[PDB]
Amino acid sequence: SHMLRPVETPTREIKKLDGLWAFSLDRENCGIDQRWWESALQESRAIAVPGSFNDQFADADIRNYAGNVWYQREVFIPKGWAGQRIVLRFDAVTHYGKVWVNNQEVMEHQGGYTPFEADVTPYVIAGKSVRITVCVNNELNWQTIPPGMVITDENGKKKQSYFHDFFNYAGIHRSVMLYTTPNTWVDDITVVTHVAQDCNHASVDWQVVANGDVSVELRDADQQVVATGQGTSGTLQVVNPHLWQPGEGYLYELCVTAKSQTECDIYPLRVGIRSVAVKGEQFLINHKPFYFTGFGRHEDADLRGKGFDNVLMVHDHALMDWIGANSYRTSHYPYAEEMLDWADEHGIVVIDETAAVGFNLSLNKPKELYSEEAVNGETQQAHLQAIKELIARDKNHPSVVMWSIANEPDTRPQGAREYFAPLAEATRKLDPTRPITCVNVMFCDAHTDTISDLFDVLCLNRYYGWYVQSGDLETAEKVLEKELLAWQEKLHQPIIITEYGVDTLAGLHSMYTDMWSEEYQCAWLDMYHRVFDRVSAVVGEQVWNFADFATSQGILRVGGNKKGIFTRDRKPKSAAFLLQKRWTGMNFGEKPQQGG
Amino acid sequence: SHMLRPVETPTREIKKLDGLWAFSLDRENCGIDQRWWESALQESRAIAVPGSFNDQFADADIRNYAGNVWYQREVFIPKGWAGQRIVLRFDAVTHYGKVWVNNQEVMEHQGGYTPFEADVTPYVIAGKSVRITVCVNNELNWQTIPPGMVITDENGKKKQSYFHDFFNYAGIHRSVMLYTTPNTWVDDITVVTHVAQDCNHASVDWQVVANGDVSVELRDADQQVVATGQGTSGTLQVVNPHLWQPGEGYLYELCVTAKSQTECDIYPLRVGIRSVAVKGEQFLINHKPFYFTGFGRHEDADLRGKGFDNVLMVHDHALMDWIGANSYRTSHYPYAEEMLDWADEHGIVVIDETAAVGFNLSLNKPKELYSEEAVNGETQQAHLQAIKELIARDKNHPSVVMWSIANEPDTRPQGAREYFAPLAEATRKLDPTRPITCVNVMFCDAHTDTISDLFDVLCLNRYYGWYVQSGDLETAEKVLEKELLAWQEKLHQPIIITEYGVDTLAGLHSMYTDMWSEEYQCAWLDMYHRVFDRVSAVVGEQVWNFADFATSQGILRVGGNKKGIFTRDRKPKSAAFLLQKRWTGMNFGEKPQQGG
Numbered sequence A, B: 001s002h003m004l005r006p007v008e009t010p011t012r013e014i015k016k017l018d019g020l021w022a023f024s025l026d027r028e029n030c031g032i033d034q035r036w037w038e039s040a041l042q043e044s045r046a047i048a049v050p051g052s053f054n055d056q057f058a059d060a061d062i063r064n065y066a067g068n069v070w071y072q073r074e075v076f077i078p079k080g081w082a083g084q085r086i087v088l089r090f091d092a093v094t095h096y097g098k099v100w101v102n103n104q105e106v107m108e109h110q111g112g113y114t115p116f117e118a119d120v121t122p123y124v125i126a127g128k129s130v131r132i133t134v135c136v137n138n139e140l141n142w143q144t145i146p147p148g149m150v151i152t153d154e155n156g157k158k159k160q161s162y163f164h165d166f167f168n169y170a171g172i173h174r175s176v177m178l179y180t181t182p183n184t185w186v187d188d189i190t191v192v193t194h195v196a197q198d199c200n201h202a203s204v205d206w207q208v209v210a211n212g213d214v215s216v217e218l219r220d221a222d223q224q225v226v227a228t229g230q231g232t233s234g235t236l237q238v239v240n241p242h243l244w245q246p247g248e249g250y251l252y253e254l255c256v257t258a259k260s261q262t263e264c265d266i267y268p269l270r271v272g273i274r275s276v277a278v279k280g281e282q283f284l285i286n287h288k289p290f291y292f293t294g295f296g297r298h299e300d301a302d303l304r305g306k307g308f309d310n311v312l313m314v315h316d317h318a319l320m321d322w323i324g325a326n327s328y329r330t331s332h333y334p335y336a337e338e339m340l341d342w343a344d345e346h347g348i349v350v351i352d353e354t355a356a357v358g359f360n361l362s363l364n365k366p367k368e369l370y371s372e373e374a375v376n377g378e379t380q381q382a383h384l385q386a387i388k389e390l391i392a393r394d395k396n397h398p399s400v401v402m403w404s405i406a407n408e409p410d411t412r413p414q415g416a417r418e419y420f421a422p423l424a425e426a427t428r429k430l431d432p433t434r435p436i437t438c439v440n441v442m443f444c445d446a447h448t449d450t451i452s453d454l455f456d457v458l459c460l461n462r463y464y465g466w467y468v469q470s471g472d473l474e475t476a477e478k479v480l481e482k483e484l485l486a487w488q489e490k491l492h493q494p495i496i497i498t499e500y501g502v503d504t505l506a507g508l509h510s511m512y513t514d515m516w517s518e519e520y521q522c523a524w525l526d527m528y529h530r531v532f533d534r535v536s537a538v539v540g541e542q543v544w545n546f547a548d549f550a551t552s553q554g555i556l557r558v559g560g561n562k563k564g565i566f567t568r569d570r571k572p573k574s575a576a577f578l579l580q581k582r583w584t585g586m587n588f589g590e591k592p593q594q595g596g
Ligand SMILES: CO[C@H]1CC[C@H](OC)[C@@H](NC(=O)CN2CCN(Cc3ccc4c(c3)OCO4)CC2)C1
Pocket: A163, A164, A165, A363, A408, A441, A442, A443, A463, A467, A468, A554, A556
């Protein structure tokens, strides 16, 4: 399908974001049978949308519940919407959503981090109130992204198992809304920005419109015309440009219009003029060598889980700005779309990740990771569909300078290369603008990994001195460099360390600088930094993690993952000031001299 | 003014609550001179609405800033709103707010926890976008509610000082919105429910016909009519009612409609049929003795300050439900209306407090608390105005069973009674339905207080064994018991302990059960409970506080107030289980019977 983020000029949305819906559990799994969307939810309670449902009620049985849950809400439809196209859009339902309006099923989606909309005009009457019922499922299998395993015991109780670290939060995590368009409406737009060395730049477009002759206008920050184009097809207007840069993040506004015989529809699209491309061992942004600093993040907060919140987004960006982070990565799933709009605006570099995590068996399980049990052709299809929807959404965001197909898959079994080759090829077919990468797990080193050649940038997740060599800084430095040099002598690609960090308990201090202590984190990060600056092919460092986040229960996780630089309530550990000295002490975007 | 909370039948709001607005500090105080509302705010950054501005940017200088701040946001007015009445309403701008639509000043308010709206119909055209600029001021003086003092140093730098505990968070803390009505609209409604002894009940109404003939219809939970009424006011129909009781919270829907010669306006009002009355030492709800259990709360959270959030509300009510709390008190300021709508629904008893706290000097300052300098006739006028706006807003909420005029004022100077006697009279005139109270500070005991007779219910804030008799439980028990009995033999009023608690560091454990330890909190609260059950006049217990909250910097406050049962991230201390065992172990609503 085609996807475009709603705005307001001749279009009007009403947020059904109003917090409180009706919520109910379907423990007996009657809901779809007893047609629960037809009547008002029985034995229901208030719940906040957006937000995960697991933590809202301080209940253990609800937090670790797997199966179907029901959302329901009434809404009055605007009067001036009669004879207009009305769309119902969810920014994300986590895992699975089925929507009904009144009694009419109108939607279905698998994929919990991408939006899905539907024309609902014939099932709605302006000035009248309608009932919106959503059925949310949080179950993961081997054909879902991410993968999982559900276990039904003798008592008929489901219990979900997964292969990634972060907790399986679910529910409507993001923005719900009705929004309108003329019956001649724009449903799709595509933009590609070419910039030379370095005088001027061209901009191609391609967009489809329901009834409509197409004019396009490239407007400046002053809303002044700097260029114009005719026709639906490719435009290519040249300009002496203010480039989209990581320091400023300048933006133009391409205004695209669609004229019918009776109707007219306008649509403003934010545009950043920049080019991303790999040239040897360097990552070039606007034909300039760049050095990634920042974090692997997580949509995780104390009471809302992965539910989006504006306050949290302002504070988290204030800390990253303060600490010197010039970039980050949407770790293990597509983030809220508002996150990327912020990045576009403030010139923040973003590596965009799919929800493709947990392709592992190592750490009644299948014997072959790539087989009809476990991962198969259907899984490959869902992965392909997942790669599609992310690009269909984020292709127009200047902040995205890379695509990440998956996170830490085991590429040691046989089917590994057979699985990833079509995907890596199909992705470059979907977007030639941005380089693509695949994040590499530890035990898949330079002599064992079988897929690192199919991608443009080498992204490594390393933990020498923690999981291995535990506690030995002397040996870890030796192993890391030799491992990095091995990767260099093999692919000669740009290397970004996309995950490095250790578990650190805030308030734990040690004179002996041992594990789990704040001293260790500082010392451990310090050793990694010295290794990075001795290797030319290293062009990026993203600390794991930004903040402490929640995980599934285990002996390896003390109330969640404690590898954060900040606590879960965003209080800084000693390492935050260490990272602050380094990241702000270097020339922006420019790598540290080889011992300097 | 007349104040009704917006709804949806022929009224339609677009929540422009949506978070991102432009923010700017006015350190030099140019804004009003240079007419900043004429142009787009210069040098601005994104900020979340609703929410305090102090913590959103992790900046200390912004956190402790005193003066003027500027908010700004553009918004499209709905097309189908032409020829309709358009109002711009703020649910609360903390302390001072001045609004402009484009260049047209439309609003001005003092009072930071009550709403203020304005007709903007002639200054707005449907289908077009307008610029909204708000000027927020966070300065407190002796004529503000609450009172404060500004200190300007040699360098002309302002620094706010106040006399209450909680931190002075400011900014747009609640809902900003535009909404419509027919030009014949309902502007006010007031309902008084009289109940005979549980068989049947009468319901008075009185409403202001902004422009129309008035009819009223009383519907139940099944949407069927149980009674009807005609004319602008003065109805009094009898009903066979399902009463609004604590624990359940049954509600009727009074439908008020106003017909012109051309237009009609509908307004649904939730109505709870219950009676509140004091009878000797007892507090009677529906002619039955009731026992308050619960908390003194605070609109406080980690990153949003006093900014409202649905998730936070849902979770906090889940905690209070679990722990057995049947009630609470809006500590030290009016809470968001959505908190009272929740209380109405779930049958939660609420003591409603004004922002009149800090009428104290005891704990270059004025020598007389009640004088022209300090608390004078202007203050009394602003205080009366504060009681007005609070009652005008919350009068129709079944959950509110008591008005609280002030919190812990010093009643030792002479002018104390000269000041409060008019206020207590004016309050009983504004609403004869509910008893009035004034929360009594410690050093104003049974032989020192000069004003507690002017109120219906005795509310005491006690801390024996903490501030005084520090650490001694045996002596504290004697003093407390002796003090409670003295109050009983003096006023013969119902006594509610509205504040009792000790500072407790989560994780601090002691075998000696000394102060600041989780053990002490349990021992201290338990001792207090033994005394309560030995005094008949005690009809309420409200622990201070629900959760740890932020305060101004001091040697008595360890990173804020730690008297919470829960931490600021809503994690339970050992005392939480102690209270849950007591509150859920007693029969609902009934005083412990000596009491097991
Ligand atoms: C002593 O060697 C073992 C010790 C345990 C480590 O984590 C299982 C092992 N893992 C690794 O070296 C590389 N991992 C890949 C997966 N990654 C995420 C993760 C981490 C902890 C988890 C989990 C997933 O699911 C259950 O608990 C951490 C880094 C090595």
